[PDB]
Design a protein around this ligand. Sequence first.
Ligand code: CLA
Ligand code: CLA
Ligand SMILES: CC1=C(/C=C/C(C)=C/C=C/C(C)=C/C=C/C=C(C)/C=C/C=C(C)/C=C/C2=C(C)CCCC2(C)C)C(C)(C)CCC1
Lengths: 42, 136, 212, 65, 219
Amino acid sequence: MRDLKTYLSVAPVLSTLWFGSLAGLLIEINRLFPDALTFPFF
Amino acid sequence: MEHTYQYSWIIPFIPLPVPILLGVGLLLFPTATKNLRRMWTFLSIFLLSIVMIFSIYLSIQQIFLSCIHQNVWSWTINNEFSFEFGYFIDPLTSIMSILITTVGILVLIYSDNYMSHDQGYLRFFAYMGFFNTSML
Amino acid sequence: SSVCEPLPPDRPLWFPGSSPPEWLDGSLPGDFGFDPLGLGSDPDTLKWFAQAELIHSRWAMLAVTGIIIPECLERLGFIENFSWYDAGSREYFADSTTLFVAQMVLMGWAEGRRWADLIKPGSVDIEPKYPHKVNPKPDVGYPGGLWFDFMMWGRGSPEPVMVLRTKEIKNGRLAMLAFLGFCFQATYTSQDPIENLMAHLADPGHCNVFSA
Amino acid sequence: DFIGSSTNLIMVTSTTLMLFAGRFGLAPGLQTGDPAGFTLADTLACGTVGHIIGVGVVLGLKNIG
Amino acid sequence: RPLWFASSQSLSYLDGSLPGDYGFDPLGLSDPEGTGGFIEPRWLAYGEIINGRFAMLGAAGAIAPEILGKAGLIPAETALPWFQTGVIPPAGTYTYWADNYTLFVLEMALMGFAEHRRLQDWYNPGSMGKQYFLGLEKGLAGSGNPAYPGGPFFNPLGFGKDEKSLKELKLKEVKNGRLAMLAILGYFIQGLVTGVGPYQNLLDHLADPVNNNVLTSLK
Ligand code: CLA
Ligand code: CLA
Ligand SMILES: CC1=C(/C=C/C(C)=C/C=C/C(C)=C/C=C/C=C(C)/C=C/C=C(C)/C=C/C2=C(C)CCCC2(C)C)C(C)(C)CCC1
């Protein structure tokens, strides 16, 4: 869709998409590996 | 074994209806069925593919299970005939069935282009499908 | 003979009497002007969406086949305990996770070759060359080829190429919707598609979605 | 309701007296066949106001007396 | 020229150009200047005609199962009022060959094919005779007016070949349709205020007209 990809390219729409994806990533990581205080995998 | 040999009577009769439709098509409406020129080709190839898959399935059951099925019906019952037309599934049946079907499918894929510049097209595939019917 | 001639402007539309959009002139197969939202405005993206529709429809067609035909064989007495929406949970070898990564490897090769076709058409060419023989340059999504057009039906042998591609696309849109029906009515009935068909054909009035 | 009662009489007379006060009286397009104005809007207006007066007086009479 | 509660502005667009131009627009709905959406003097004419036709079908199909049912001519099972037929499941329900929601999907699909076509004929009238609708689009093309298409399918007989008879028939149509719309309003309000059928209301008012309308809000 022309000019919708330009709107979704705009800084707030793109920032909310990036930070929603990133926050879901961090959230699911903390579900998978909750309560982390060390990196023991070396 | 329980429900797959009772439907072993179709593997002669599955190629049959496209030579039946060509034998009433070319003999009655030649412009019509020759206007449907390449469709009966793929229909014969598809019906022989059905017979190929079913013969492969019977071959898999022959190499797994050692049994012979002799699904005979009755054909004439008047006197000493009591005739049958049944279907005898030995390993020789499996070898011969895949030997017919694979070669016939490949010759039909070949014959789509071998006859593609032939005025005689559909009666050749009627002869092909009726031959595959008869040999199976 | 092999030109991919489009549909005329006075073609049948999805909504008769409506104006087809200007970005659906008819170059693509199955062009009936369906665009209430207009997701195919950018033609460089409408090409990708046409390829998307084509591959989506081909996979949906193979899938609806692999759902209904084997269920017919189960009703005939060939396959045991068949249920497509429980045929991933049931047992095989390779745990269904080794199968997944082997699938991703092999389909990654295949769909990556297709991707390289999409990005740049002549990169991954097949149907090997022959002396004094000019293999025709194909289109994206319809490679032709010795492997995908061995009967030579794509260049327009039995029927024209446009009507055959339209046949592919229409039959496949119908298959896409059939698979959506599979994915929905196998979870809101927890039953078999062919069983649902025979159940609705028993009493079409009261055996509908509103019973459940 | 119960035509002839007090609740009917002192409501009918209020409605008709307001229609009169709008027709020939001090109270006040839509061309009616009426000699001098008093359109459908004015008719409904006087009926509404006469019903206001009627409700007021019947309930002031039901409160006391 | 007969004017029923005409106004100063209503005699600026309802001159004679519509069936039933009695000039009754006191509120000022069909004013042509400053229009849009569905408040248009053409769309409102179309809406009058269509709600009147559907109301005529409603009026002579909602009391018909009770005009007959209290005189024989049908089973008493298929002799319910307009509201005890499944259209008010709180008030009543009949069991047809399908459940009521399958019948609603039927209504929706069949009327969708019947009325989206009508709508696209409202937008561009030349359409509905150009797409292959099983060849029966030959009769669905001729529109002229949008509300009065008049083709082989909807107007098989002439019934208004001349413009005098057609004008008189259009007037009769809109007047019987307004009467039927008022009748449907009476049906709804009577079923709401009594809970019985409209024919029961007629028989109760005719025979011994006692408590004709005195039963205000009582079932
Ligand atoms: C700046 C100060 C600071 C610091 C150092 C920390 C540090 C931490 N906090 Mg605290 N916190 C802070 C501020 C801070 N926080 C603030 C301001 C708040 C309020 C908003 C909180 C609220 C808070 C809560 C409520 C919780 C924490 C938790 C944690 C722990 C995170 C564990 C986790 O999920 O990471 C895991 C690691 C990641 C998410 C990073 C993954 C990155 C991706 C996957 C890429 C990495 C791979 C990459 C490709 C490279 C590979 C190498 C090669 C192969 C290529 C960690 C000890 C959590 C915890 O466990 O408590 C101790 C927890 O529950 N914090
Ligand atoms: C994978 C899905 C898919 C994709 C990508 C396309 C892509 C395309 N179609 Mg096809 N089509 C599909 C499925 C798809 N179609 C199916 C299933 C039908 C039958 C219902 C049709 C019927 C159809 C017609 C009749 C026509 C097209 C046309 C087009 C083109 C323009 C529209 C566009 O860009 O939409 C892009 C679409 C998407 C990106 C997918 C939509 C994804 C969003 C998120 C919505 C998904 C939710 C959906 C509404 C759920 C269904 C709910 C259920 C109750 C029905 C384009 C090539 C027109 C054309 O020129 O043909 C070539 C045309 O006339 N399509
Ligand atoms: C002269 C004459 C005439 C007439 C007369 C008369 C006598 C009339 C009457 C009329 C009437 C008689 C009317 C009425 C009306 C009414 C109304 C319009 C009402 C309203 C109401 C309301 C609005 C209500 C409200 C309320 C309520 C609900 C309760 C609460 C409170 C209140 C009150 C607020 C004519 C034309 C025939 C002709 C000539 C002769």
